[PDB]
Each structure stands twice: as C-alpha cells, then as structure tokens.
Amino acid sequence: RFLKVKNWETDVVLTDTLHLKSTLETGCTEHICMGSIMLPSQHTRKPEDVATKDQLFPLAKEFLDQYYSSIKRFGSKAHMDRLEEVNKEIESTSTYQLKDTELIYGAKHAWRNASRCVGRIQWSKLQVFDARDCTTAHGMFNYICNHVKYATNKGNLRSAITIFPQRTDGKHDFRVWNSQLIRYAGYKQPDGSTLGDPANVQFTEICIQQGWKAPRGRFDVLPLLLQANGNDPELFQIPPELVLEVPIRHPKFDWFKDLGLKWYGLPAVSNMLLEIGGLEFSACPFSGWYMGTEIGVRDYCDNSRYNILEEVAKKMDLDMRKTSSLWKDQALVEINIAVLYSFQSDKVTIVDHHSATESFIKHMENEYRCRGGCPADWVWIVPPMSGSITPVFHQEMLNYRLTPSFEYQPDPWNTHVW
Amino acid sequence: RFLKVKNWETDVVLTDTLHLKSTLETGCTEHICMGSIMLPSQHTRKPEDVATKDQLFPLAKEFLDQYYSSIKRFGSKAHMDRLEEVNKEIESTSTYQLKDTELIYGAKHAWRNASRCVGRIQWSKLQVFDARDCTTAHGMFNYICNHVKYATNKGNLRSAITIFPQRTDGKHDFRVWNSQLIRYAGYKQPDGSTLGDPANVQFTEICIQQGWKAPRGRFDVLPLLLQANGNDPELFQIPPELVLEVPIRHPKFDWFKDLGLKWYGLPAVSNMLLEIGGLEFSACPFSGWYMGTEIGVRDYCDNSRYNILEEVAKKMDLDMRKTSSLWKDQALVEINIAVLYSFQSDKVTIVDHHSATESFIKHMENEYRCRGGCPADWVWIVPPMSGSITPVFHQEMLNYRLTPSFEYQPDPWNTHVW
Ligand code: HEM
Ligand code: HEM
Ligand SMILES: Cc1cc(N)nc2cc(-c3ccc(OCC4CC4)c(CN)c3)c(F)cc12
Ligand SMILES: Cc1cc(N)nc2cc(-c3ccc(OCC4CC4)c(CN)c3)c(F)cc12
Ligand SMILES: C[C@H](O)[C@H](O)[C@H]1CNc2nc(N)[nH]c(=O)c2N1
Ligand SMILES: C[C@H](O)[C@H](O)[C@H]1CNc2nc(N)[nH]c(=O)c2N1
Numbered sequence: 001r002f003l004k005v006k007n008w009e010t011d012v013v014l015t016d017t018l019h020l021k022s023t024l025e026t027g028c029t030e031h032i033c034m035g036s037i038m039l040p041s042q043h044t045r046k047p048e049d050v051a052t053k054d055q056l057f058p059l060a061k062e063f064l065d066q067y068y069s070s071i072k073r074f075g076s077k078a079h080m081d082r083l084e085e086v087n088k089e090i091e092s093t094s095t096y097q098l099k100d101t102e103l104i105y106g107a108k109h110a111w112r113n114a115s116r117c118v119g120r121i122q123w124s125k126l127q128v129f130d131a132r133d134c135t136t137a138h139g140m141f142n143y144i145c146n147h148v149k150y151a152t153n154k155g156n157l158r159s160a161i162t163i164f165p166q167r168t169d170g171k172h173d174f175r176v177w178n179s180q181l182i183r184y185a186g187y188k189q190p191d192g193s194t195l196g197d198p199a200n201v202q203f204t205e206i207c208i209q210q211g212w213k214a215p216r217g218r219f220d221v222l223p224l225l226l227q228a229n230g231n232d233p234e235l236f237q238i239p240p241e242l243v244l245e246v247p248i249r250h251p252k253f254d255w256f257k258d259l260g261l262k263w264y265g266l267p268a269v270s271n272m273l274l275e276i277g278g279l280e281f282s283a284c285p286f287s288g289w290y291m292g293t294e295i296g297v298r299d300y301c302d303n304s305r306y307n308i309l310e311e312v313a314k315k316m317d318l319d320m321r322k323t324s325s326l327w328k329d330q331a332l333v334e335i336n337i338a339v340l341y342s343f344q345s346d347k348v349t350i351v352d353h354h355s356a357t358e359s360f361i362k363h364m365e366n367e368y369r370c371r372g373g374c375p376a377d378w379v380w381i382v383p384p385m386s387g388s389i390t391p392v393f394h395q396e397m398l399n400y401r402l403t404p405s406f407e408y409q410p411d412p413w414n415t416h417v418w
Numbered sequence: 419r420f421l422k423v424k425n426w427e428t429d430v431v432l433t434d435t436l437h438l439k440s441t442l443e444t445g446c447t448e449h450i451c452m453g454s455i456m457l458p459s460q461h462t463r464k465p466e467d468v469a470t471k472d473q474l475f476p477l478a479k480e481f482l483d484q485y486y487s488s489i490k491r492f493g494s495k496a497h498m499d500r501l502e503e504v505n506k507e508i509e510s511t512s513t514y515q516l517k518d519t520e521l522i523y524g525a526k527h528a529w530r531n532a533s534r535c536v537g538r539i540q541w542s543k544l545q546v547f548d549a550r551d552c553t554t555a556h557g558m559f560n561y562i563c564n565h566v567k568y569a570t571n572k573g574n575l576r577s578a579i580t581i582f583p584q585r586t587d588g589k590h591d592f593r594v595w596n597s598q599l600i601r602y603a604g605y606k607q608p609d610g611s612t613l614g615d616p617a618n619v620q621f622t623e624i625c626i627q628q629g630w631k632a633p634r635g636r637f638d639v640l641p642l643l644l645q646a647n648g649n650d651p652e653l654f655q656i657p658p659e660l661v662l663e664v665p666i667r668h669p670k671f672d673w674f675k676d677l678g679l680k681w682y683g684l685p686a687v688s689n690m691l692l693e694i695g696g697l698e699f700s701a702c703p704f705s706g707w708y709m710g711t712e713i714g715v716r717d718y719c720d721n722s723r724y725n726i727l728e729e730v731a732k733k734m735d736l737d738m739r740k741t742s743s744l745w746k747d748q749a750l751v752e753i754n755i756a757v758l759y760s761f762q763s764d765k766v767t768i769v770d771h772h773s774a775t776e777s778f779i780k781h782m783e784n785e786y787r788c789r790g791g792c793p794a795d796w797v798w799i800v801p802p803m804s805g806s807i808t809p810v811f812h813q814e815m816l817n818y819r820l821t822p823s824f825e826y827q828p829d830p831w832n833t834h835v836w
C-alpha cells in the first residue's frame with residue numbers, strides 16, 4: 001500500500017504514496033492487465049455520463065481541499081467558507097463555477113496528472129486562458145486565434161490552454177470539432193491512395209460537406225469547425241500568418257529538400273475533455289511544443305499516415321528487397337535528425353526524445369519527493385524509436401488516474417443532434 | 419467478459435474469450451496498473467511457497483482436463499481413470515508424477531502461455547528432453563551438453579527444453595545457478611570499469627569464489643554451476659567445440675571487424691521455473707534462437723551492459739557533442755544490421771525484429787481463432803528499437819497469466835543452505 005518502483009539502468013528506487021489518493025479506475029483487474037488498450041472506457045467521457053447535483057459536492061469538496069491544502073491554507077475559514085459557498089450553489093444551481101485561481105490550479109494539475117504525457121516537467125508553466133464568457137463560434141474563433149499567436153510566440157513556443165464554458169445540460173455544448181487546431185487535410189484519390197494526411201480524411205470530408213474549399217494538395221491547413229453552446233458548427237480559416245510551419249531539410253543529404261516536406265510548429269490538441277472538481281469542459285484546446293518523434297516517427301512513417309519510409313530509403317539507395325537489411329530503421333533515424341535540425345535552425349522550440357525522456361526522469365524524481373509519486377504510462381512514455389537507449393525504458397512506472405484530468409470524448413459528429 | 423482488442427494499423431478486431439480460463443493473478447488492480455513492473459511478486463516463485471497435498475489436486479485436475487480435452491478425449495474413462503490415478507498418488511505420496519506425454523504437453527504450453535515472448539509462433543515445435551532420472555551434477559552437466567549440441571544443430575537452431583527432477587521438499591532442489599547456459603564473464607577493474615559483461619559480474623565472482631580459473635578477458639564463456647538434489651553446486655566447463663559463436667562484421671564498414679565483437683548463437687535461459695499441474699521444476703533450461711535486437715540493442719548498448727555506442731559512433735565519426743544529433747540512434751541501427759548480417763552469413767538461425775513481430779501478429783490471429791485469445795505483454799513484445807515501424811506497436815494486447823507457465827525464482831545463492 002506504499003508501492004516500490006525500480007529503475008534498472010541506475011538501481012534507483014522510488015516510493016509511491018501518491019497512488020493512495022487515486023479516485024478514478026484503470027480498466028485493469030487482478031486477473032487481466034489492459035495497460036495497452038488505447039482508449040479504455042475509463043479514459044472516455046460520454047455527454048450522457050455527466051454528474052448530478054448529488055455526485056457533484058464530493059468532487060467539489062475533494063478538489064477544494066487539495067486546492068486549499070496547496071495554497072497552504074487547508075481546513076481554514078477561507079477554505080471552509082468556500083466549501084459552504086460551493087455547497088450552497090450546488091444545491092441552488094445544481095452546478096457551480098470555479099474561481100479564476102481555481103481554474104488555473106485545476107488546469108495545471110490535469111496536465112500534471114496526464115500519465116501518458118512525457119513533457120510534464122513543464123506542468124506549472126502553463127498559461128491558462130479563460131474563455132468561459134464565450135457565446136458564439138466567432139467568439140471561439142477569436143479566442144483560438146489569440147491562443148495560437150501567444151503559444152506560438154514567433155517560434156519560442158509557450159504552453160497554453162483555452163477553456164470554453166463548461167458543459168451543463170449536455171445539449172448546449174462547446175466543442176472544437178477539429179482533433180487539433182492546426183492539422184493537414186486528408187484527401188482520398190481515384191485509385192484509392194491518400195494525398196494529405198490519411199488520419200483526417202474523415203474530418204476533411206466533413207469540412208467539405210459543410211462547404212470547405214479544399215486546395216486538394218498535401219499540407220493544406222484545415223479550417224476550424226467550432227460548435228458553440230450546442231448550435232451547429234461553423235467554418236473558420238486561421239489567418240495563414242498565424243500558422244508557423246517548418247520546411248524539413250537535412251544537415252547532410254541535399255536531396256532531402258527535394259522530398260518537399262514540412263510540418264506545423266504548434267501541437268495543440270482540441271478534442272479532449274478537461275475535468276475539474278466534477279465539472280466537464282468539452283472545449284479546452286491545449287498546446288506545448290513537439291518531441292521530434294511525434295512528427296518524424298509517427299506522423300511521417302506510420303503505415304496509415306504519411307508513410308514516407310518508401311521514398312527516403314529510395315533516395316538513400318538502400319537494400320530494400322530483404323526485410324532484414326533494416327532499411328526501414330536506417331531511414332527512420334535520418335528522417336528524425338532532419339526534423340530536429342530543421343526546427344532548431346528555424347529557432348522553433350523542439351525537444352529530442354533523449355532530452356525529453358531524461359527530463360521526465362528528473363520530473364519523476366521531483367514528483368516522488370515533493371508529491372509522493374508520479375502517475376506514468378510506460379506504453380505511452382517510451383518513445384516510438386530507439387526505445388531502450390532512453391532512460392524511461394528502464395524505469396518502472398506506476399499508472400493510476402488522479403484528478404483534475406484530461407479525458408477523451410466521442411467525436412461530436414456521432415453525438416450531435418443537428 | 420468477452421473482451422475486445424483492436425489493431426490501429428489495420429483496424430483488425432479480435433475477441434478474447436481465453437482470458438476467462440485465467441487462474442493466476444497479474445498484480446494490477448482496478449485502481450493501479452503494474453504493467454511495467456519488471457519482476458512482480460505474481461511472476462515469482464519462492465521455494466517456501468510450494469503447495470501442499472490439498473492444493474495439488476485442483477491444479478492436477480485442472481491440468482489433466484485441459485490435456486485430455488486437447489487429445490480429443492475429455493471426460494472419458496481414460497481421462498477419468500487418470501484423475502483417479504493422480505488423486506490416489508496425491509493422497510499416497512502427497513505429490514505425483516507426469517507421463518512423458520503430459521510433460522511434453524505441459525512444457526509446450528508453458529511456452530505458449532509466455533506472454534512476454536514474441537517467438538511463440540513456434541511453440542508446438544519444441545523438443546522436450548526428460549532429465550527427471552538425473553541424480554548428480556555430472557548427470558546435469560551431461561544432459562545440458564546434449565541439450566546444447568541438439569539445439570545448436572550446427573547453426574540451424576532448434577528449440578529445446580531439458581527438465582530436471584521436480585521440487586519436492588524444497589531443500590533437495592535441482593538448480594542451474596547460471597542465468598543462461600552460455601554467457602560471457604564479467605570482471606570489474608582497478609579503476610572500476612567493467613571488462614566482459616557487467617550483468618554477470620556478481621555471478622562471475624561466485625564461480626571464481628568456487629575456484630574458477632578466469633582468463634580475465636572479454637568474451638570468456640562462463641563455466642556451468644550445477645546444483646543437484648540440494649547438494650552444493652559444482653563447476654563444469656562446456657566443451658568449447660559445443661559453443662557456437664558468431665564474429666560480428668558489417669556488410670559496408672570494414673572497420674567493424676576491428677571492433678572485435680562476437681556473440682554466442684544459442685539463447686538458453688537456465689534460471690527460471692517451469693510449473694505444470696502444480697508441480698515445480700526449478701531446473702529447466704530452455705532455448706531457441708535470437709531476435710537481433712536482444713544482442714544488438716540490449717546486450718551491446720544498454721548503459722549497464724557492453725555500452726558500445728561510444729566507440730561505434732566514434733568510428734563512424736559522428737556529431738557527438740550535441741545530444742539532438744541522434745548519433746546514438748544512428749549507431750544503433752548500424753550495430754543491428756551487423757548482427758543480422760553476421761549471423762546470416764554464418765548460416766546461424768536468427769530473426770530480425772520486423773520478421774519476428776509480423777509472425778507474432780500471425781500467431782496472435784491463430785491463437786484467437788483456434789484458442790479464443792493469446793495472452794501478450796506489450797511492454798515486452800514491442801522491440802527495443804524502431805518500436806512503431808513494427809506491427810506489434812499498433813496491436814492492443816490483453817495480458818493475463820494462464821498455466822502451465824514459466825516463472826522467475828530467486829537466485830539460489832540467496833536461499834541455499836550451504
Ligand atoms: C510542453 C511540451 C510538451 C511535450 C514535449 C509533450 C509531449 C507529449 C507526447 C510526446 C505525447 C504523446 C503524444 C502521442 O504519442 O501522440 C503527449 C501526450 C499528452 N500530452 Fe503532453 N506534451 C507537452 C505539453 C502538454 C500540455 C501543455 C498538456 C495539457 C495542457 C499536455 C497533455 C497531454 C495529454 C493529455 C496527453 C495524452 C494523454 C492521454 O491520452 O491520456 N501536454 N505529450
Ligand atoms: C524460438 C525462438 C524464440 C525467440 C525468437 C524468442 C524471443 C524472445 C524475446 C525477444 C524475448 C524477450 C527477452 C528479453 O527481452 O530479454 C523472449 C522472452 C521469453 N521467452 Fe521467448 N523466444 C524464443 C523461444 C522460446 C522458448 C523455446 C521458450 C520456452 C521454452 C521461450 C520462453 C520465453 C520466456 C518465458 C520469456 C520471458 C517471459 C517472462 O519474463 O515472463 N522462448 N523471447
Ligand atoms: C500538448 C501536446 C504536446 C505534444 N508535443 N504532443 C501532444 C500530443 C497529444 C496527443 C494525445 C493523444 C493523441 O491521439 C489519441 C488517439 C487518437 C485517439 C494524439 C494524436 N495522435 C495526440 C496531446 F493531446 C497533446 C500534446
Ligand atoms: C528462449 C529464448 C529465446 C530468445 N531469443 N530470447 C530469450 C530471452 C529470455 C529472457 C527472459 C528474461 C530475461 O531477463 C529477466 C531480467 C533478469 C530479470 C532475459 C535476460 N535479460 C532473457 C528467455 F527467458 C528465453 C529466450
Ligand atoms: C496498441 C497501442 O496501445 C498503441 O499503438 C499505442 C502504443 N503507445 C503509444 N504511445 C504514444 N506515445 N502514442 C501512441 O499513439 C501510442 N499508441
Ligand atoms: C522498466 C521496464 O519494465 C523494463 O525496462 C523492461 C521494459 N521492457 C522490456 N522488454 C523486453 N523484451 N526486455 C526487457 O528487459 C524489458 N525491460
């Protein structure tokens with residue numbers, strides 16, 4: 001009940017007392033481990049499965065207690081008067097409203113608790129933008145544009161989150177239908193192959209269905225589809241000057257520019273749900289900067305993504321008949337030296353998987369000492385290439401789900417009543 | 419209760435009904451996932467925690483039923499007369515003895531159930547050597563030498579297991595003290611650095627402590643330390659002609675021979691415990707062939723193993739000041755093309771991590787169709803380099819512990835009464 005996690009590269013041993021405070025569930029049982037299921041039911045939020053006035057006050061009290069404990073005023077009168085104040089509003093309104101300071105704490109700790117995120121050494125350096133006064137899709141488009149500008153910061157990227165009004169009933173819901181604020185379109189072809197990004201082919205067509213004007217090329221930035229207060233979503237195009245992009249070159253191979261690759265600088269995921277004190281925020285886009293491999297390994301090289309190992313190995317002229325020539329591996333390392341180099345030579349913030357995973361080990365030390373633990377998902381923390389030459393491969397990690405938290409939710413076009 | 423596992427590269431969906439038959443536990447709970455703890459208490463067997471005459475007959479019946487079900491004679495008279503026969507012996511002797519055919523089935527299914535093993539497409543092609551008539555360490559050394567010869571098969575390797583007498587009391591225990599039959603010595607130095615293999619430095623010194631004559635070099639094959647029926651273990655040196663080794667060269671870089679590397683062909687793990695029908699076999703060395711990465715990635719490049727990324731990147735002349743030049747990754751791929759090439763050009767059976775992981779996906783299809791599932795540990799199945807350009811990265815796997823099974827046990831020098 002005071003568990004032990006070893007590192008097998010250092011023999012360092014840490015002790016996790018934080019998992020005791022865990023409330024949510026994991027999907028594993030004593031007789032089956034689901035640690036490799038991608039989207040377990042526990043990590044998802046249906047708009048039906050909200051909460052009711054009863055369910056709310058434990059979640060509120062629980063949250064308020066950890067907040068006042070953290071500003072060094074647990075159980076005090078200022079604390080207890082807030083419990084009463086929320087209590088009264090939860091009886092009255094059946095819901096309740098967070099202070100600015102409570103929204104900022106709750107947001108930063110949903111990132112801090114994000115067990116699948118390797119960048120968390122930065123969790124308290126998060127800029128929270130309060131968009132809870134937003135009422136229209138145009139309002140949403142305005143707040144999201146300012147988010148992009150700020151977080152992008154001319155390439156010196158800054159973490160940020162923009163938080164639209166919380167769910168209440170379930171129908172009147174704020175939702176960004178894009179999975180990420182900046183994303184490349186995906187168009188299928190006559191012969192069936194895919195230009196652009198296969199991941200977003202479904203979404204690309206929903207935008208065309210709502211009347212988008214697709215420049216049917218490769219790296220076409222999708223428009224935003226913003227649903228405000230349950231009303232049908234509306235298309236807006238980010239001003240291109242606001243979309244920072246990196247052309248991908250190589251510090252040795254001159255033909256790498258010929259490949260004609262580029263990516264956007266800002267990873268800003270827009271489809272997930274923030275949960276603070278039992279309140280659900282269905283529109284909460286959040287952003288930081290990339291780890292190289294997310295582009296260079298997954299985006300570019302997943303078979304069902306850009307799938308470029310083909311042409312890169314070609315231009316390297318590689319033994320491609322035999323599978324055991326490791327021609328796939330060989331071209332994957334070059335593609336990742338190129339994304340790093342390109343981003344750095346353009347002064348756009350990026351981290352390599354070695355730097356980031358050492359920071360996570362550092363951050364894990366801090367959380368275990370100053371917090372009693374650090375929830376971590378090994379399956380997601382280990383980078384998708386050169387796994388075992390990074391320190392996180394040899395680090396045993398306890399996974400458990402604390403709150404405040406980020407969660408998945410269905411795509412709104414499967415649930416929305418039009 | 420009839421769970422679903424998706425593949426996210428193919429959208430293939432499989433259904434696991436086999437996990438229902440699961441008996442052992444996993445270490446995870448509804449509130450915490452231990453899927454990345456290396457040696458969980460559930461995967462270990464203490465020599466105290468055997469079983470007693472009561473505990474035995476369920477385990478026997480359970481095992482016997484799955485055996486007779488599998489030779490297409492469930493619940494029959496031949497089956498029921500065996501249940502009675504074992505029952506009687508479990509009352510009489512408080513233990514019992516397996517048929518040859520029951521030992522062979524049980525062994526093959528302990529491999530079949532090995533959730534952390536990616537080579538299992540081969541599980542029914544396993545040669546079982548019955549060493550249950552062995553009484554002395556010299557007998558053990560004889561059986562192990564024949565195992566090496568057979569399994570090595572002049573380079574065309576064959577899977578095999580040799581099974582020494584089962585535990586009974588707990589003191590009179592057959593144990594191979596080596597962690598693997600063939601392993602390279604590990605000697606510390608004056609300045610502290612390690613020649614040989616750092617992993618086995620502890621074990622190397624126990625052999626010297628028992629009087630081994632160390633040729634204090636690099637790739638010195640350790641002697642066997644064989645404990646028979648609880649008596650103190652005894653040193654034997656495998657005839658060198660029986661130890662097949664591969665010198666490691668590169669199909670491009672001529673300086674790769676200068677590195678002066680080699681590995682043994684036969685991976686044969688000797689320290690684990692086979693568990694069949696509630697009987698414990700503490701000495702059961704088992705072997706197949708290597709996947710490249712176990713040598714080329716872990717053995718050669720782990721910081722606390724051979725740790726050669728240093729010199730390889732040097733001879734490639736690599737940007738080594740900056741961490742983000744990926745010089746570590748770049749040299750890891752070359753080292754793995756070299757292990758593959760060397761093993762193949764010597765006609766020694768080896769598999770690359772791409773070939774092996776596709777086979778595992780094939781094997782997983784077969785087990786789900788003809789067995790209702792396949793227990794799998796993603797943390798261990800995904801290879802330690804180029805993780806996400808192999809199909810197992812995108813395959814959700816259910817982990818659960820069936821029986822017959824292989825298990826860890828303490829090192830005998832911490833438990834043995836001398
Ligand atoms: C500041 C630099 C950051 C870096 C380098 C980083 C890194 C990563 C990486 C590599 C992943 C894996 C993504 C994938 O595999 O597709 C991830 C996931 C994630 N990140 Fe971070 N991140 C950063 C900032 C943030 C911020 C600011 C937030 C929230 C406000 C956040 C929350 C998350 C969440 C919720 C996940 C997925 C967890 C899940 O599926 O449950 N990250 N991150
Ligand atoms: C025939 C070719 C085989 C291949 C390519 C193979 C491959 C592998 C690999 C790559 C690992 C990971 C080892 C590590 O990461 O250090 C592993 C583990 C393992 N293998 Fe296999 N293996 C083979 C045969 C066998 C046989 C014949 C047995 C048993 C009779 C076996 C049982 C196991 C077990 C028990 C583990 C560890 C599971 C645990 O820790 O619970 N394998 N195997
Ligand atoms: C702030 C941030 C920075 C970064 N550097 N990376 C990030 C990656 C994700 C992320 C989480 C889950 C994802 O996918 C879930 C599969 C679709 C269901 C994806 C996209 N693959 C991204 C994320 F949220 C935030 C990230
Ligand atoms: C038959 C076979 C073939 C192969 N190709 N590979 C194999 C690897 C292991 C294995 C399992 C666990 C291990 O280590 C556990 C850590 C020490 C506690 C190691 C050595 N690292 C090897 C094994 F059993 C059998 C293997
Ligand atoms: C099946 C498996 O759960 C799936 O491929 C996961 C594995 N680990 C991952 N890890 C990260 N960081 N991102 C991912 O998309 C995935 N995908
Ligand atoms: C901490 C973590 O459990 C440990 O590094 C594991 C990870 N996965 C592994 N996978 C394999 N195949 N072999 C290993 O030794 C390990 N080590």
Ligand SMILES: [Zn+2]
Nearest residue numbers: 028033446451
């Ligand atoms: Zn689990």
